Design a protein around this ligand. Sequence first.
Ligand SMILES: C[C@H](N)C(=O)N[C@H](CCC(=O)N[C@@H](CCC[C@@H](N)C(=O)O)C(=O)O)C(=O)O
Ligand SMILES: CC(=O)N[C@H]1[C@@H]2OC[C@@H](O2)[C@@H](O)[C@@H]1O[C@@H](C)C(=O)O
Ligand SMILES: [Zn+2]
Length: 179
Amino acid sequence: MLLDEGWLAEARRVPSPHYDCRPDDENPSLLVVHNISLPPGEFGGPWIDALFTGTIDPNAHPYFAGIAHLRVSAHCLIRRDGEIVQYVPFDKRAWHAGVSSYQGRERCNDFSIGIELEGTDTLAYTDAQYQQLAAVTNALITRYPAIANNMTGHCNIAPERKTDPGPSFDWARFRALVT
Ligand SMILES: C[C@H](N)C(=O)N[C@H](CCC(=O)N[C@@H](CCC[C@@H](N)C(=O)O)C(=O)O)C(=O)O
Ligand SMILES: CC(=O)N[C@H]1[C@@H]2OC[C@@H](O2)[C@@H](O)[C@@H]1O[C@@H](C)C(=O)O
Ligand SMILES: [Zn+2]
């Protein structure tokens, strides 16, 4: 698949107010794999889109009140059925990493692209998600060659704060699909 001005040519575009500029409009060089599910352990809601666009109803589930105060986003979500949703163009800074460090460099939001897999640390991701994650990643690598050398989990850049994408994320299968 192709990239069009920072947007996946093939994705549902859900443009989020939750983004700003990368410092000096630097090119991203790191892919951070995440997972997300809202409410925890459940799939298919509107809640992920709502969280990443700042419109979530704090009252729709006991879990939501707590994260309503957050200001977060990711570049893309890949749903259980493989559907790709993009909230932030890749050249812009999404708010997905939080306090983090990679190879000595902090504030990974600055130089990373965040892709969220709908799922949990302990449940297998779907065949569609691996296929689609790979297609997106291959596209990103074409545009930003350094990503080929720099793919990581949120848990690796924020250890003992974050666990996503967890043991369930099969790095071997994923890497085999990439470039
Ligand atoms: C969606 C993502 N996976 C997420 O929820 N994780 C959050 C990611 C949170 C995150 O990036 N905050 C940013 C800033 C948040 C908003 C701020 N720029 C603004 O203008 O309002 C940071 O620390 O620079 C986590 O790890 O704490
Ligand atoms: C424990 C945690 O920090 N919060 C979960 C929760 O679910 C939605 C929102 O709040 C998201 O920030 C999140 O994280 C994970 C798994 C992630 O960063 O991918
Ligand atoms: Zn994460």
